[PDB]
Enzyme design. Structure first.
Site, PDB file in Angstrom:
ATOM      1  N   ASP A   1       0.791  -1.238   0.000  1.00 52.39           N
ATOM      2  CA  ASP A   1       0.000   0.000   0.000  1.00 52.39           C
ATOM      3  C   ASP A   1       0.829   1.299   0.000  1.00 52.39           C
ATOM      4  O   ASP A   1       0.292   2.374   0.220  1.00 52.39           O
ATOM      5  CB  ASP A   1      -1.044  -0.004   1.134  1.00 52.39           C
ATOM      6  CG  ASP A   1      -0.422  -0.170   2.520  1.00 52.39           C
ATOM      7  OD1 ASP A   1       0.763   0.168   2.723  1.00 52.39           O
ATOM      8  OD2 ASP A   1      -1.134  -0.625   3.426  1.00 52.39           O
TER       9      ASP A   1
ATOM     10  N   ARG B   1       0.636   6.642  -0.180  1.00 46.70           N
ATOM     11  CA  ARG B   1      -0.053   5.622   0.598  1.00 46.70           C
ATOM     12  C   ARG B   1      -1.477   5.458   0.037  1.00 46.70           C
ATOM     13  O   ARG B   1      -2.229   6.436  -0.081  1.00 46.70           O
ATOM     14  CB  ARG B   1      -0.072   6.042   2.068  1.00 46.70           C
ATOM     15  CG  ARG B   1      -0.889   5.156   3.006  1.00 46.70           C
ATOM     16  CD  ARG B   1      -0.331   3.750   3.107  1.00 46.70           C
ATOM     17  NE  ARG B   1      -0.895   3.046   4.264  1.00 46.70           N
ATOM     18  CZ  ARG B   1      -2.069   2.420   4.265  1.00 46.70           C
ATOM     19  NH1 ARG B   1      -2.822   2.388   3.162  1.00 46.70           N
ATOM     20  NH2 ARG B   1      -2.486   1.820   5.370  1.00 46.70           N
TER      21      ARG B   1
ATOM     22  N   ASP C   1      -5.518  -1.411   3.869  1.00 43.12           N
ATOM     23  CA  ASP C   1      -4.390  -1.820   4.674  1.00 43.12           C
ATOM     24  C   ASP C   1      -3.903  -3.180   4.191  1.00 43.12           C
ATOM     25  O   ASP C   1      -4.589  -4.200   4.339  1.00 43.12           O
ATOM     26  CB  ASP C   1      -4.770  -1.857   6.159  1.00 43.12           C
ATOM     27  CG  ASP C   1      -3.563  -1.949   7.078  1.00 43.12           C
ATOM     28  OD1 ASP C   1      -2.497  -1.393   6.753  1.00 43.12           O
ATOM     29  OD2 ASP C   1      -3.693  -2.564   8.146  1.00 43.12           O
ATOM     30  N   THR C   2      -2.723  -3.179   3.587  1.00 45.05           N
ATOM     31  CA  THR C   2      -2.051  -4.418   3.245  1.00 45.05           C
ATOM     32  C   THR C   2      -1.203  -4.831   4.443  1.00 45.05           C
ATOM     33  O   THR C   2      -0.759  -3.975   5.220  1.00 45.05           O
ATOM     34  CB  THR C   2      -1.160  -4.271   1.988  1.00 45.05           C
ATOM     35  OG1 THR C   2      -0.164  -3.277   2.228  1.00 45.05           O
ATOM     36  CG2 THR C   2      -1.983  -3.837   0.783  1.00 45.05           C
TER      37      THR C   2
ATOM     38  N   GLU D   1       2.144  -5.760   6.384  1.00 47.81           N
ATOM     39  CA  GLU D   1       3.553  -5.364   6.247  1.00 47.81           C
ATOM     40  C   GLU D   1       4.319  -6.550   5.662  1.00 47.81           C
ATOM     41  O   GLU D   1       3.883  -7.700   5.800  1.00 47.81           O
ATOM     42  CB  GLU D   1       4.158  -4.965   7.607  1.00 47.81           C
ATOM     43  CG  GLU D   1       3.442  -3.814   8.330  1.00 47.81           C
ATOM     44  CD  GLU D   1       3.612  -2.463   7.637  1.00 47.81           C
ATOM     45  OE1 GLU D   1       4.721  -2.183   7.129  1.00 47.81           O
ATOM     46  OE2 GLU D   1       2.637  -1.672   7.611  1.00 47.81           O
TER      47      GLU D   1
ATOM     48  N   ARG E   1       3.287  11.536   3.321  1.00 44.90           N
ATOM     49  CA  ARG E   1       2.872  10.604   2.272  1.00 44.90           C
ATOM     50  C   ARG E   1       1.628  11.106   1.563  1.00 44.90           C
ATOM     51  O   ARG E   1       0.668  11.534   2.214  1.00 44.90           O
ATOM     52  CB  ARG E   1       2.620   9.204   2.848  1.00 44.90           C
ATOM     53  CG  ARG E   1       3.830   8.562   3.526  1.00 44.90           C
ATOM     54  CD  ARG E   1       3.572   7.106   3.878  1.00 44.90           C
ATOM     55  NE  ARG E   1       2.420   7.001   4.771  1.00 44.90           N
ATOM     56  CZ  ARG E   1       1.951   5.876   5.305  1.00 44.90           C
ATOM     57  NH1 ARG E   1       2.535   4.709   5.056  1.00 44.90           N
ATOM     58  NH2 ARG E   1       0.881   5.930   6.101  1.00 44.90           N
TER      59      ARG E   1
HETATM   60  C1  LIG Z   1      -4.275   5.248   5.079  1.00 45.64           C
HETATM   61  C2  LIG Z   1      -4.023   6.415   5.993  1.00 45.64           C
HETATM   62  C3  LIG Z   1      -3.077   6.300   7.005  1.00 45.64           C
HETATM   63  N1  LIG Z   1      -2.834   7.333   7.832  1.00 45.64           N
HETATM   64  C4  LIG Z   1      -1.831   7.190   8.912  1.00 45.64           C
HETATM   65  C5  LIG Z   1      -2.508   6.725  10.191  1.00 45.64           C
HETATM   66  C6  LIG Z   1      -1.611   5.629  10.737  1.00 45.64           C
HETATM   67  O1  LIG Z   1      -0.791   6.225  11.733  1.00 45.64           O
HETATM   68  P1  LIG Z   1       0.162   5.397  12.719  1.00 45.64           P
HETATM   69  O2  LIG Z   1       1.395   5.164  11.901  1.00 45.64           O
HETATM   70  O3  LIG Z   1       0.372   6.392  13.842  1.00 45.64           O
HETATM   71  O4  LIG Z   1      -0.590   4.152  13.120  1.00 45.64           O
HETATM   72  C7  LIG Z   1      -0.718   5.199   9.585  1.00 45.64           C
HETATM   73  C8  LIG Z   1      -1.068   3.814   9.035  1.00 45.64           C
HETATM   74  O5  LIG Z   1      -0.320   3.585   7.837  1.00 45.64           O
HETATM   75  P2  LIG Z   1       0.461   2.202   7.548  1.00 45.64           P
HETATM   76  O6  LIG Z   1      -0.653   1.205   7.388  1.00 45.64           O
HETATM   77  O7  LIG Z   1       1.217   2.478   6.273  1.00 45.64           O
HETATM   78  O8  LIG Z   1       1.355   1.996   8.748  1.00 45.64           O
HETATM   79  O9  LIG Z   1      -0.856   6.202   8.576  1.00 45.64           O
HETATM   80  C9  LIG Z   1      -3.554   8.555   7.681  1.00 45.64           C
HETATM   81  O10 LIG Z   1      -3.318   9.509   8.458  1.00 45.64           O
HETATM   82  N2  LIG Z   1      -4.485   8.704   6.717  1.00 45.64           N
HETATM   83  C10 LIG Z   1      -4.758   7.704   5.862  1.00 45.64           C
HETATM   84  O11 LIG Z   1      -5.625   7.857   4.980  1.00 45.64           O
HETATM   85 CA   LIG Z   2       0.161  -1.419   5.764  1.00 46.80          CA
END
Ligand SMILES: Cc1cn([C@H]2C[C@H](OP(=O)(O)O)[C@@H](COP(=O)(O)O)O2)c(=O)[nH]c1=O
Ligand SMILES: [Ca+2]
Length: 129
Positions: A15, A29, A34-35, A37, A75
């Site tokens: 993702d 992103r 959510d894929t 890791e 991102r």
């Molecule tokens: C998909 C997405 C993630 N995020 C943030 C929240 C999550 O924060 P935390 O890192 O504090 O948990 C993180 C999850 O992404 P990942 O799934 O790439 O880790 O990215 C957003 O703010 N908006 C979004 O639309």
């Molecule tokens: Ca992920």
């Protein structure tokens, strides 16, 4: 919304993808998914699926929604399209992503993604097996 051009710099995992957008490097992103890791179950498979999709595409487009365009990590928050095909829906439909991270503003294709999720679930695909 409106699709915008971008060029692939490199695939990163299921993702996240690094693209050239408006002439600048940028990590994107995928919205609404959510894929796993890489170090997790179906991580390598989701990573490879996305990599395939972006790398073999002649045309990469990005689509911002009506909410927040960039996350806390800098991102870009977008739908990515590869020769017209949404990567976000593709992963979910094959059960390599769960619908997740639904914020106001950025939920245009939420119901579209949920449809694809039920279908992967019924077919017990990957994540859902
Ligand atoms: C998909 C997405 C993630 N995020 C943030 C929240 C999550 O924060 P935390 O890192 O504090 O948990 C993180 C999850 O992404 P990942 O799934 O790439 O880790 O990215 C957003 O703010 N908006 C979004 O639309
Ligand atoms: Ca992920």
């Amino acid at each position: 919304l409106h699709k915008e051009p971008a060029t692939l710099i490199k695939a990163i995992d299921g993702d996240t993808v690094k693209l050239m957008y408006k002439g600048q490097p940028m990590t994107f992103r995928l919205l609404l998914v959510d894929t796993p890791e890489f170090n997790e179950k179906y991580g390598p498979e989701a990573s490879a699926f996305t990599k395939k999709m972006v790398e073999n595409a002649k045309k990469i487009e990005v689509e911002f929604d009506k909410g927040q365009r960039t996350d806390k990590y800098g991102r870009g928050l977008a739908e990515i399209y590869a020769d017209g095909k949404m990567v976000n829906e593709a992963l979910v439909r094959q059960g390599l992503a769960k619908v997740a991270y639904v914020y106001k503003g950025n939920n245009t294709h939420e119901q579209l993604l949920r449809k694809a999720e039920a279908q992967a679930k019924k077919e017990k695909l990957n994540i859902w097996s």
